Design an enzyme around this catalytic site. Structure first.
Site, short mmCIF file in Angstrom:
data_model
loop_
_atom_site.label_atom_id
_atom_site.label_comp_id
_atom_site.label_asym_id
_atom_site.label_seq_id
_atom_site.Cartn_x
_atom_site.Cartn_y
_atom_site.Cartn_z
N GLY I 58 -30.39 -1.50 -20.73
CA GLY I 58 -30.43 -0.12 -20.93
C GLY I 58 -29.58 0.71 -20.14
O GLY I 58 -28.56 0.34 -19.65
N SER I 87 -27.31 -7.44 -19.43
CA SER I 87 -26.53 -6.05 -19.02
C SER I 87 -27.36 -5.78 -17.76
O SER I 87 -27.34 -6.64 -16.79
CB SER I 87 -26.44 -5.13 -20.14
OG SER I 87 -25.93 -6.04 -21.23
N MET I 88 -27.72 -4.48 -17.95
CA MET I 88 -28.61 -4.00 -16.83
C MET I 88 -29.81 -5.05 -16.13
O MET I 88 -30.27 -4.90 -14.96
CB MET I 88 -28.96 -2.45 -16.74
CG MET I 88 -29.11 -1.82 -15.44
SD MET I 88 -27.70 -1.71 -14.41
CE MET I 88 -28.01 -0.78 -12.95
N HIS I 112 -21.92 -8.28 -19.09
CA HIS I 112 -20.90 -7.47 -19.77
C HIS I 112 -20.56 -6.11 -19.15
O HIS I 112 -21.69 -5.77 -18.43
CB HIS I 112 -21.13 -7.41 -21.25
CG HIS I 112 -22.31 -6.49 -21.68
ND1 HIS I 112 -22.61 -6.27 -23.22
CD2 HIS I 112 -22.78 -5.33 -21.01
CE1 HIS I 112 -23.42 -5.20 -23.24
NE2 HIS I 112 -23.61 -4.82 -22.14
N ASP I 161 -19.07 -9.84 -24.06
CA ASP I 161 -19.96 -10.44 -23.60
C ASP I 161 -20.06 -12.00 -22.95
O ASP I 161 -19.33 -12.64 -23.88
CB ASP I 161 -21.09 -10.34 -25.21
CG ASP I 161 -21.58 -9.10 -25.52
OD1 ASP I 161 -21.23 -8.18 -24.68
OD2 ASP I 161 -22.34 -9.27 -26.49
#
Lengths: 178, 182, 179, 181, 179, 180, 179, 181, 181, 179, 179
Positions: I58, I87-88, I112, I161
């Site tokens: 997010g 991700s985060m 990513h 990704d």
């Protein structure tokens, strides 16, 4: 629709193409074509191609009654599918001149509708659609040679027929071969 | 919906005193609640009267019959008191309270009419639906006849269209026993 | 709509008007204009009005109705499919002796529909107006069918469906047009 | 809605027999107000109740559920208009115990005829029109009884939206006193 | 819309104009242009304006009204179906002696409608404007009907439906056109 | 609900503080009126504090609050933080004389009432006359509470008129800018 | 829109341009093209611009305004119904002595409307631009009416409705066109 | 939102004089933050308060309600940027007690000019423009006082979105220290 | 969400120093996680904390509010990936105390480059581009420090990704151990 | 949801967890927290996981699956109604010998569903990922049922509905719980 | 749009092209086709391009721009109403000495607008491309106005409105076209 479109050119040769659902606009146009063709020549056959999923029963009866009213024979030729009121119109063609192409499908079933409101209004709508089914089945009986009881049984659910089956049933006279 | 601390919401506080408020459309959720309250009050005390206030535009006939049959099934008398409006199945439930204990306040309105419904699909499906709602109207009219003293034929005529009654007219009709005066 | 003239314009050349839709102000404007044009062409020859219509606007239907009665030619009316509500009123408005239905055509008569919104006095005005409109429709239907006003009132309280033969018995048409 | 054992502010006021009608009137609101009136009578049938009214009005039948309960119960129900009492809100303001109907000086009162709708067959529109006209006659008759005004005057004065100041409401008979600071 | 010219263009050849819709700036622009065109072709021969309209924009109506009064030919007005609000104003604007309605046509008169939003002083400006517009409409209706301005104010406070015969008595038309 | 359920506003209400931080509608007015009545019942002599950060809102809802303030015995101090606009600034000016404040970067806006009207000409006339009378009522009270003439208030409210805290003091809408 | 040419094309043959809508870029494009066409056909004969318009885009209106002043023929302006905002600006822009309104036509003048969104400096740019546009409109209106710019500013602060007689007195038109 | 025995986690932190700003700034958030600041001063007017800021900014007037309350109360308000402090969020970060404004090492700070809108008549757009320009002058004047930067440099540096690292915010004077682990 | 007697299940785990990060990361979630971490440190500055992560990631700035708080507080924060950390989310997984970063055997890790958007004038798009590029450099630098991978490798491995099993995440240096049954 | 606790909380006191919905991250987070809490309460006593679920997120399902395999207590699984897709995977994940279905419960296995949008290379990455995820699911299903991976691949190509008896015979459960 | 040919077709016969809309690929296709047709009819006579446009697509604008420069005839440009953004770029692209604005037409210049969404690297590609496009536009504007590139960069940072006289002084046009 290529061009004075392709349908007008076929109309010049007494061919009417039904290729949609049956509603009042479609019926008004077809009725007008039939009347015009009779005015042009009261003797020559007319050809009605039917590829239709059906639609309004009253619009279908506008077409049906016009077919039986005019003097020329109306040949009916099922291509693709004639379902519901479309197969009723297919069976309505001049006796001996009702056809289907070999891979065309025919489907018969009971009429559909709706009713909303007070109990008495629902009762009126139910009586009307039941009387409408009786009228359809009576005419299908006369036009196919099948009993009304058999038509009632055979239309309770969606009933798909091949062209060969439609011929055996009496909905058409011949499978049109190449 | 204020709270009363002895912590009850106001309706729960009134239920403690055997009062049930029907103040909405009748659906299965509302009927589920009303029935549960009736059963609970009976479990608490099977002799003391229950008080059912009715301000309702009516609604589901089957949900109303869940309430109706529960009223008749339990031992305590269920007094009915119409405030504001009792229409359609709401006036049916008003007329279903214990005999002699059905009331309306002077400016409450009572409306009776035939049941509403619908039907979609094949002709034989529409026929089944029509036959069902007609049988349901017969059932309602027969019970209304018993509870009001009116003939079934008069009820049929008087419910063909929306029929609005004052409280005084509701008493004369037999839908309630008294107008509750100040 | 094929070309020959589109098909309707070709039929209009032969004094045939097709009503095949809901009646609204646009349809009535067109039908009225066609009737006036045909009278201008020839005040003596019959006009033929085919009707397949669920009805629609009462005032639009009366634009057509009054034009029919105003002009000199007889207007034959021919029901195909369905003539309902104001459509059935127009079917009964054809020249006496020249109102027809095909054998499987359906006819339906019923009281007018409308709406009313706002203050109590505004609802009263709207109610009085629709009640007067129904009395107007029933008076004309009485004279055009031979039925009493009381019978028309009662027979239009709810949707009343008629077969072509019943419509003839009722006096809404003169003959079922047989093949 | 702050809290004050814990009460929201309205529950805290209800402990002092104060009921706040501060919204449009519908069946949910009337159900709550009626239940509060019955509860307060059950707690004490002698002590006055205080009904504050800031309402644009709303459902006539829901308003009459409140109206009839006020007249049914034993306690006097004082009515106090703050901000606005319009339509059925002004009808309920006039419904307070005689001598105990109040408005604050800048509160606005509005009276007008009932509003409604009707759709469908001519005979259904007739039934709905007859029903709303009879409802208007019922409202005007009660407003005549509570204000002293003739029904003919109430009819003319409610034909259109009629806005009254607090002092005009008192002169009309809709309240008894303007509560001056 | 059938072809003969489309049907309306064909009627225009005979100096007939059909108003069969709500009145707005587009409709008025078309009607005004037809009136100017017809005057240009012949400044002596009558023009016929058929009216079946629920009314619409007051300013658009006045574009039509002033053009009728401006041009040299008489403009006959003929109500079919309904002439309501600004539609009945235009019906009464036809040449005196040449305003007609068919027997079952309906005429309705009422006060103008509008709206306003924003600051108190903006609402005041909009209220003063629509009130002055109503005075203007009533003064002209008074002149064209023979009824007093005070009676028109009273009679238009709410929707006021009139039969063709009542419209004649009122002075909105000169005659009910019989068959 | 923001932190504790017994929230921060309820804790401030125990100390006679009412926090207005939203548009003014009937719900907000009913809550604030009820809080004012409650506080008078607890003690009719002790001051009440009304913080105002509001873009304004319903005029009638605002008059429910205004008249309640004038009706009760306790002084109601008003304290503008952020913005008091339209009926928010009317309520700011209605605090106890000498006890109306704004913080130094708080903003005050005054303007004429807003509304709408739809329907027949005579209905629009009724709606216009009503909103004109409501504006005269607002201007008369604002004149009484600021010392400005009615004509000047009319002029100064014709359009949106933004004022700094210091300008609002000069205008008479508040008594003091509260400095740190 | 009937055929004779459509009706507007037919009027254009007689050097008449009908403005009967809001003013936007498409409308301005058409009217400018008609003006240029009419100049090319005859650089001496008058043109007639009828105006029933609630106004619209100021820049599109100035496309029309500048073309009127550019071409050699006089352009008469005739207000029917309503000329509001940029519509009244165009009415005042007709050849001096040849600006008209019909007796019940209305004229409305007010300041321009717009919007601004984004960063403070962007709102500032937008505010300066619409203020300069108003100064441009008021300056030209002052020259075309004889009124001072101060009076025009005061009189356009809010919607200002004028009768035809008032618009003549104001200098927005030269004559009320009587029947 | 977890519970600690009963407090929600934010109420538990408020017990320790910690206030969490973790959202856009609007009137509702300002009302809550102002109330928390007044509450903490009432408990103890001497002990520091800690305001964590992770905010994209929001309403300038709502931010000034918070800003003025911070300056009004007696306790020092430490400000600690985590995540991001943008627009009015970075204004409030810079508003903490001198010497007690912090950012964690990877927190971001962004400054820019205020955003707004205007619709209607030319004179209304002029009023809206003049108001937002005055508001920008007020914001820049205070940012100049709190950062030590000239008003002209603040104006230049806020014309477009201007992103700063924690270390850059310290050198700029928006914070006093980057809080290292 | 069931109750334990009265704690909801998450509050009951928090009593045992367990924080559940089980949703997309935004400012609200970061506000709650940060508050929980601060609370737990105040309860006990020595005992480990356990942060379970099942998150698609997010907001990068919200994630850095959590990241910096983890590095700021005294207790070790163990990180345990269940389900997915993308991700985060995977950035916070790798942020756990060294030697105490875990994934269960079928948990999925995905890395990513950051996502965002830009709209408006050419110079505004340039500002937004420069900012997201600088954010990516910041993320890549910290991930290099925390995994042992070069910045160049992280750059190429995050271009698209990149899905990793738990075993692959351990070999990559994002976690220290796959937690076997 | 009744009180006495809510009903699910009262069952949790007895080490029963109810899964009766789609599997998403919110559900998985709650079920994982319930499993960890129950282990902390007692590391030896069995846990009971009822499953009526149409499936859902694969990664959310694996949060639950890995937590089941990680904790010390045995987790019985009991299928009521339906266990489909990731639901049937969790059903097969119960402690060996303690995986059950009720006699009319239905089980459904099929391959994972997903989507991919964008550049060809992005679609390729998404395809490889979902294909790898299916290999993982099939490998574990093969381990937990005793069926070959090739058979699992074949039997999940399409929706494959199984009776409770077929599920037991397949190795997905150990016993059909009889009344 | 009246008939004479619609009015725009009539003007094209006299080598006049009207741009009166936003610039998109559809508008650019039509304008380019008209330009090529006119050159084929006559490669020597001037073409006249009227511009009232808020601008639009930069690539669509360059389709028109490059076609103007490609063909042999001079293309005069005439701004009526407003030429903004790519509209003012095309205005400045007319044949030297043959670029005009009417006295109250407005000219606006600003930097290109766009957007980007997705991965950092995709945002970078999009930012680089729009910055290059701005350099391309400013370079050509510099050549056609005589202003330096650095002044054009400064002057286009924000919306910059110019009167016709200011646009001439800037070098965006050659003459203000007086009546």
């Amino acid at each position: 629709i290529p061009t004075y479109d392709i349908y007008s050119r076929l109309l010049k040769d007494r061919i009417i193409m039904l290729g949609s659902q049956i509603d009042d606009n479609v019926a008004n146009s077809i009725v007008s074509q039939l009347l015009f063709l009779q005015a042009q020549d009261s003797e020559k056959d007319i050809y009605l191609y039917i590829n239709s999923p059906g639609g309004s029963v009253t619009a279908g009866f506008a077409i049906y009654d016009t077919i039986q009213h005019i003097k020329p024979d109306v040949q009916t030729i099922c291509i693709g599918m004639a379902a519901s009121m479309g197969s009723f119109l297919l069976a309505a063609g001049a006796k001996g001149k009702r056809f289907a192409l070999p891979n065309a499908e025919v489907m018969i079933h009971q009429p559909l509708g709706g009713a909303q409101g007070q109990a008495t209004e629902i009762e009126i709508a139910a009586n009307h659609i039941l009387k409408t089914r009786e009228k359809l089945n009576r005419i299908l009986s006369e036009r196919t040679g099948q009993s009304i009881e058999k038509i009632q049984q055979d239309t309770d659910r969606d009933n798909f027929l091949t062209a060969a089956e439609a011929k055996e049933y009496g909905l058409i006279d011949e499978v049109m071969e190449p």
